[PDB]
Structure 1
């Protein structure tokens, strides 16, 4: 092969490899056709490995002549060649993109890659709209970039069924099978596992079996009881899979494999230490094998630009699986991976909107440069030809922290401005509470006024907001925290319209939003905070391994009460404890609010479903229903608390709200927090929901809104009217 004809094969390979959405078997197909075409030499076998900018073709003429093409990267950085021969190459050399290896017998053994099949489970009835699965996509890209294995990806999100999974597995004959098992997928996982082991027993498969993600990590005993040879990946999967591949080659013993729990021969459960992955530089662009099918389901692009939480102190948030340190992608890798995913999505006409999976997008570094890192990512996005939109999550104190200097906070505001400039769209802030006592119980580290100011600053930059809010928690005593929460949620001095920066410095804008009451009033949207709450009337869920669960167990012993039911055991499928409230009135209110939600779910689901596809004028009508429902749901709790503990100010607000909707006389005990009385009070309040749904009914009859073909709004409205006051579950 001439030195000029190297160049031609590289040129065409670069064009093949640029199509990063194709599965590796499809890439190999195009490589075979390119090499059979020139017919200026024949070969026995080809292998493609690597990914995106390091994709590599091996052409095995036989074991004594092996050609290696690396169009996108210096072959000297190839990790498979480096494992085979750490000094094969010349250090003083122009970059090398081709090399023929002659009489290199052991290189062939390195090119016999094991096969790994990774399966993302999905209960499709609960999640109709897929998102690119990072759980398996990053495990695949890590293995491909290290050239450790041929990886097959199966995603139940796009409709692949249990029986199709097994068919796939029989056809590919993998050496390692891995299932990602998430909340609510225990039964599905056990079904797939039963069939895998049934076929191992029958001799149709021989594979190391492993499961990963949070459900088996937290509850390994229920898995080991049914599958005692199963290997559970406790934390990150990358090095775990690397080491199972080594163990396949007898290069590691089982008790050396990174980050797994297993049953040894004596019957005892072992856990191996998990070395935290070098995420900054070893985990590349998620594999995009499934992207085409995801686009057919109108699915979403996703990326994780950091792992972990440097704060890690919220008492309801368990840190054992996700870890207590923050590991960011480099600015360079973040921009590259975003470019890859956006280019691949554009190929399938997926719109350029990235959902960042990060637990904490902004983070914190020992050198304090985290804000400059974000600004540098934003500057890179602003250099692109096309704009993007992106969503992410952040704590309120990643916006505003009065324990830090004014200069820290002013630079924080500049950072958030660059986020808005680069496309920050809907941002989730974990406010969680409006009550300083409850915030302390939540370990949030924030105050209620600090939360208000964070919302002011972000909303003023034109970023749209969503907030988590956990109204009820089991250790709350009395109604005081609920009153503080309701007052917080009714504040109208928090949400700002997008403010034109004009000539203001960052410091002047910051100063005005903190202190200038007239500025705040002029720019407010006038909407109360509860309008951006993600889930109204939410109650605490007590997950395993949390400080909050231990706080509960500690109240159980200190006041001699049995709060954790199921005889102290947790639920494996949901990774949480079933727990009752220390204050029985508060538990009654939480239960009532869940029943309220259940009673309106069918009709409000239908309204929201119709809203997705309505014309502009119907969309606004249906949206106004959803706004009014949220409003009625907020003042349900204000009304319940009023009937348990009245005050003058709350009475005025409820009377204002009634009078505002021409329905002050629709409503006509006290201090009685029994379930019976609360239900009776809520039956009364439900008359206000009836008044809203009578308008929906009239609008439907008038043709002002349009029903689905199966008459779903008609059907659910009819049921709702017939079910009034009838709180059976």
Structure 2
């Protein structure tokens, strides 16, 4: 009945617009819509597809199948196309409904396997969830291709191991997948143990696979305990597509995209992974978990590109994330952002997107990457409500003197468009302020280039954070630390938001690079270390990095053992434990870790109180955090001074101590032993005591308010009693 068809499509379009509902809830509303007339009886229904291609099949029986596609021309349906590549007329108006009569094989295509994907989480360490793209994009890929019914389970929202197993027994999946991230080995093994014990009991029958970086990097530890396990080495989309084909006996195991496995002869095999056509095959992440994420005050995410076109930083392994850059189209980027924002608004989640991209800006062979960003920004600026979004970028995505002035001026224009469209907290992978160390890091940048990048981005009103790895194991002598400290103390890098007014981009660019009076007029006066993400950080050497091979090459070249655990990496953390080739630098790195450990409880408590404090207490608690960061920066300057004094550092340290009334602060000069370094740090810790005595007095005076369990009182009391104790 054509009147009922129109009514059914219109009602389905309204049902399918609720893209946060899980497919079972969508199906419930579809059953209630089709049971609303006794003038139609059916045997079963199936919903597949997603967002703008969601599709309902009403199976009257296997010989009469109705198909409704309210959001897209049915001729583009991939399931129907696999069943019959010429079922439709190439020249007709778009069709949104079709009844298929006596199409026996079509029923088999509609018997979709079930795939359950589980995101693991150690909720103690990560209490605030973010939309999980690892599983969300695998789900949406499979739904859009109409390859499987997908169930999503996310431990971020509190689902326990026993609730996962209960869920699996109820859903009876054909494929179970776990996303296994840093620190999740023990959780993964516990869940896998229970999965296989229930397979053994006849309660489950499933292909089991694990993915993400931890099993990809260390498969042997997984194969040793679970010999039949299949590991997804890189992207999961085509892997899951091919496991579904293998389920149907349409592929052999040695044909499945991008997996590692133990074959019949007990040998580990690897299958080639074809890089996913991300541009157009991976839609909006599935939003099944979003409602629960909003209850935990969680965050929206999106990945608008995959990979890094640079891929040369020596500490950044590329084997899992790959060495080429694959962007979403502009149109698709804007559609997916619209979807996530609309769904977030339904749950009152604030319109703040955390971009997952390793490289948001990218590089294209035709050189149009900046225009792509400007087009995305122009699309965001057409929206009715403003948004904010965060992303990461290299310093040379801002400023690159090896490129023409015209390229850099167009780059500044692009960054301005990012600011206009809502770019908020941007992370720049500076990593070092020492030209030698930058080269050991494979960053390709100079110290001065990093300063200028920060100047340009901050002048646009964007709110920067930088990565900074102060210590690295191959550093010889103290020169690179002195260079780093000098860089971090520069006050000519961070600019206030500059009113562009009637300046051209070229005028703004020229003034920020060359006009010393202009830079002075507009600086915030804050040193670079104020935007460092993690102070006093030391290099953590991951598996499969150029830096690990540089260390292994130094072990041979200088006949010294640097990689502990008998050269073996940690499977759970995907990284080596490595000593420093320069024992003094190793001692300085160790002391800085002990400094961090010694302040962690009190500073964690101050940070926790700050999140929920009134405006006046918020500023007081923030001032403690600023002072702590300052004391932590000049701790290292003080340690280096006591090993290698110079007059310039003597003045700076004396000025700082005088500003804090600690000029008095059994110390050997030039002595790099652990014992002397600890004695020096015990002395500097008296400055931290001075800060915490102000915190203590403010707490006692009622100027700041403690938590209900008296956490600040308790951690302060312990801190004072632990002074000069190190471990």
Partner SS state of residue 35, structure 2: helix
Contact 2:431 2:467 (C-alpha < 8 Å) held by counterparts:
yes
Alignment partner, residue 259 of structure 2: 260
Give per-residue Cα distances to partners, 1:599-625, cap 9 Å, x unaligned: 000000000000000000000000000
Give per-residue Cα distances to partners, 1:355-400, cap 9 Å, x unaligned: 0000000000000000000000000000000000000000000000
**Alpha-carbon distance, 1:4 to partner:** 2.5
Partner SS state of residue 36, structure 2: helix
Give per-residue Cα distances to partners, 1:132-171, cap 9 Å, x unaligned: 0000000000000000000000000000000000000000
How far apart, CA to CA, are the structure 2 residues paired with 1:27 and 1:214? 33
How far apart, CA to CA, are the structure 2 residues paired with 1:667 and 1:102? 94
How far apart, CA to CA, are the structure 2 residues paired with 1:108 and 1:703? 72
Give per-residue Cα distances to partners, 1:562-604, cap 9 Å, x unaligned: 0011001000000000000000000000000000000000000
Partner SS state of residue 20, structure 2: coil
Structure 1: give runs of 5+ residues left out of the alignment.
Answer: none
Alignment partner, residue 692 of structure 2: 693
How far apart, CA to CA, are the structure 1 residues paired with 2:242 and 2:604? 46
How far apart, CA to CA, are the structure 2 residues paired with 1:164 and 1:133? 19
1:375-524 pair list within 5 angstroms: 375-524=374-523
**Alpha-carbon distance, 1:663 to partner:** 2.4
Partner SS state of residue 261, structure 1: strand
Partner SS state of residue 269, structure 2: strand
Partner SS state of residue 355, structure 1: strand
How far apart, CA to CA, are the structure 1 residues paired with 2:607 and 2:657? 25
1:39 aligns with 2:18: no
Contact 2:667 2:676 (C-alpha < 8 Å) held by counterparts:
no
**Alpha-carbon distance, 1:661 to partner:** 1.6
Partner SS state of residue 37, structure 1: coil
**Alpha-carbon distance, 1:38 to partner:** 1.9
Alignment partner, residue 283 of structure 2: 284
Contact 1:667 1:684 (C-alpha < 8 Å) held by counterparts:
no
**Alpha-carbon distance, 1:665 to partner:** 2.6
Contact 2:667 2:680 (C-alpha < 8 Å) held by counterparts:
no
Contact 1:667 1:685 (C-alpha < 8 Å) held by counterparts:
no
Runs of 4+ in 1 over 4 A off after TM superposition: none
Structure 2: give runs of 5+ residues left out of the alignment.
Answer: none
Partner SS state of residue 38, structure 1: coil
How far apart, CA to CA, are the structure 2 residues paired with 1:602 and 1:558? 42
Give per-residue Cα distances to partners, 1:671-724, cap 9 Å, x unaligned: 000000000000000000000000000000000000000000000000000000
How far apart, CA to CA, are the structure 2 residues paired with 1:278 and 1:92? 28
How far apart, CA to CA, are the structure 2 residues paired with 1:663 and 1:494? 29
How far apart, CA to CA, are the structure 1 residues paired with 2:269 and 2:598? 47
Q: How many residue pairs were aligned?
A: 727
Give per-residue Cα distances to partners, 1:221-265, cap 9 Å, x unaligned: 000000000000000000000000000000000000000000001
How far apart, CA to CA, are the structure 2 residues paired with 1:31 and 1:661? 70
- TM-score (structure 1 length as normaliser): 0.99
How far apart, CA to CA, are the structure 2 residues paired with 1:324 and 1:208? 30
**Alpha-carbon distance, 1:662 to partner:** 2.3
**Alpha-carbon distance, 1:668 to partner:** 9.5
Partner SS state of residue 21, structure 1: coil
How far apart, CA to CA, are the structure 2 residues paired with 1:5 and 1:194? 51
How far apart, CA to CA, are the structure 1 residues paired with 2:87 and 2:40? 25
Contact 2:667 2:679 (C-alpha < 8 Å) held by counterparts:
no
How far apart, CA to CA, are the structure 1 residues paired with 2:528 and 2:288? 41
Contact 1:75 1:95 (C-alpha < 8 Å) held by counterparts:
yes
- TM-score (structure 2 length as normaliser): 1.00
Partner SS state of residue 419, structure 1: helix
Partner SS state of residue 431, structure 1: strand
**Alpha-carbon distance, 1:3 to partner:** 2.0
Alignment partner, residue 124 of structure 1: 123
**Alpha-carbon distance, 1:178 to partner:** 0.1
**Alpha-carbon distance, 1:666 to partner:** 4.6
Give per-residue Cα distances to partners, 1:329-380, cap 9 Å, x unaligned: 0000000000000000000000000000000000000000000000000000
Contact 2:175 2:206 (C-alpha < 8 Å) held by counterparts:
yes
How far apart, CA to CA, are the structure 2 residues paired with 1:39 and 1:222? 58
How far apart, CA to CA, are the structure 2 residues paired with 1:503 and 1:176? 60
How far apart, CA to CA, are the structure 2 residues paired with 1:518 and 1:551? 44
Give per-residue Cα distances to partners, 1:544-579, cap 9 Å, x unaligned: 000000000000000000001100100000000000
**Alpha-carbon distance, 1:667 to partner:** 11
Contact 2:352 2:389 (C-alpha < 8 Å) held by counterparts:
yes
Alignment partner, residue 530 of structure 1: 529
Contact 1:462 1:499 (C-alpha < 8 Å) held by counterparts:
yes
**Alpha-carbon distance, 1:6 to partner:** 1.0
How far apart, CA to CA, are the structure 1 residues paired with 2:356 and 2:458? 21
Contact 2:119 2:135 (C-alpha < 8 Å) held by counterparts:
yes
Contact 2:133 2:301 (C-alpha < 8 Å) held by counterparts:
yes
Contact 2:57 2:65 (C-alpha < 8 Å) held by counterparts:
yes
